[PDB]
Symmetry: C3
Subunit: 96 residues, 3 copies
């Protein structure tokens, strides 16, 4: 997926590059700035993506909990409303 | 919200641009690199944002579960501690 | 953590810079574009990171719910499977 540590570290290094860029604008600093940004973007995208997939599992887990609740005689008046929310919520997480 | 597929695809294309930039630095490649980054950033931000809103729903769903649990006589000793966590957790997700 | 409002706002401003860059490419617009991107990246990373930590709390909360469910005599046949999922899910959220 993605390593948050490396991303955050790289971000601070990106800041360092920016400061050097602004102090002395140059083609070198521009390219190096872009490089660091692109490398960060790779981790940025994956960490966003992986979270969504994880969220889908969380929502699916919640659905399993709803079953567990119903199993031991929880009023459907409560559960059914969560079922509506969980269904639509999951939909908003999945892609295809 | 955001389309993870298009973002990831665009990311790989951004990498392609970077490689071309480094091999032959130019104003063209710099601008095109920035363009792709900015377009990615649009999806990056929204996918981050949308997740937080979705998380708020998940936490709210958990609160509904707590009610369902209490309804059928779960010891408050357990539920009350989750209520504390869910309250603060939700707070950290909301903005305004 | 991160302020979604400021990030989204800054994103739209970044777009504005891009449009100016493309219309009239220049060292100034390039540096300013990078600056805005880097500043966004700071918020982008943190909002990604903070979510993962929040997700860990959500999964931990789900584990607490499992206990609450078991407390009042939910069939382990259901709970144990969630325990397996929650354990691995948490693992995928934590870093170190």
């Amino acid at each position: 997926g993605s390593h948050l540590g490396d991303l955050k570290y790289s971000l601070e290094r990106l800041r360092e590059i920016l400061e050097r860029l602004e102090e002395n604008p140059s083609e070198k600093q521009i390219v190096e700035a872009i490089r660091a940004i692109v490398e960060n973007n790779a981790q940025i995208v994956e960490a966003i993506r992986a979270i969504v997939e994880n969220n889908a599992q969380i929502v699916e887990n919640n659905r399993a909990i709803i079953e567990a609740l119903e199993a031991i005689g929880v009023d459907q008046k409560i559960l059914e409303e969560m079922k509506k929310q969980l269904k639509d919520l999951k939909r908003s997480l999945e892609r295809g």
